[PDB]
Design a protein around this nucleic acid. Structure first.
Ligand SMILES: [Zn+2]
Ligand SMILES: [Zn+2]
Ligand SMILES: [Zn+2]
Ligand SMILES: [Zn+2]
Ligand SMILES: [Zn+2]
Ligand SMILES: [Zn+2]
Length: 170
DNA sequence: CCTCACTAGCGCCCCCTGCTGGC
DNA sequence: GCCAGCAGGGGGCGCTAGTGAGG
């Protein structure tokens, strides 16, 4: 009906094509009055003000005081209350509570390592791992833990925990 | 018919927390 | 003990199909 002169994508109304072309290029007309961001549509600008400026969180959790801006988050929050596991893995028996978390799990079966350190060019599976690598291996005078019993230095908190559970038996 | 708003809904990515197990 | 893999509970954005309201 209304195709895109850049890709084969098609839409039914003109406003959709107008927004689709406003994504191929940076032409975000809905500008935020309280910060320096902009968006192609209004709905994208609405929530940006409710995330950062007005903190308007409509979706409430009936079990706790949690509140989310989008319903997608609450549906995910409530899963940890009921233990749901809707997203099943196709290659193993792991199930998730968030479609993107399942995408991260697949890096176990594929061996993919997208993130690499910008200093030593060492690669990792998760963006948090890399951030830790830079802290422990490329930062100067980093604070380190200390066992108050045996007087041994440990750099990571988790290592101190397992030190107490193994050597000192909690 | 045609706009333009509002609402659900998928997707993307990152954070921080905390553990495991090879070296 | 160091190191990287790896799962939980979260925040903020990219983009679009569905509904009506008013030209
Ligand atoms: Zn296109
Ligand atoms: Zn803003
Ligand atoms: Zn809750
Ligand atoms: Zn799997
Ligand atoms: Zn490095
Ligand atoms: Zn000790």
């Amino acid at each position: 009906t209304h195709k895109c002169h850049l890709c084969g994508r098609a839409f039914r109304t003109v406003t959709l094509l107008r927004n689709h072309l406003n994504t191929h290029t940076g032409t975000r007309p809905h500008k935020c009055p309280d910060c320096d961001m902009a968006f192609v549509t209004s709905g994208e600008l609405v929530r940006h003000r409710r995330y950062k400026h007005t903190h308007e969180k409509p979706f409430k959790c009936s079990m706790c005081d949690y509140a989310s801006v989008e319903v997608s988050k609450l549906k995910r929050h409530i899963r940890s209350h009921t233990g749901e596991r809707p997203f099943q893995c196709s290659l193993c028996s792991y199930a998730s509570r968030d479609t993107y978390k399942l995408k991260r799990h697949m890096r176990t079966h594929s061996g993919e390592k997208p993130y690499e350190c910008y200093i030593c060019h060492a690669r990792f599976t998760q963006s948090g791992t890399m951030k830790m690598h830079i802290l422990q291996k490329h930062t100067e005078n980093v604070a380190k833990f200390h066992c108050p019993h045996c007087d041994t230095v440990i750099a990571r908190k988790s290592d101190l925990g397992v030190h107490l559970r193994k050597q000192h038996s909690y």
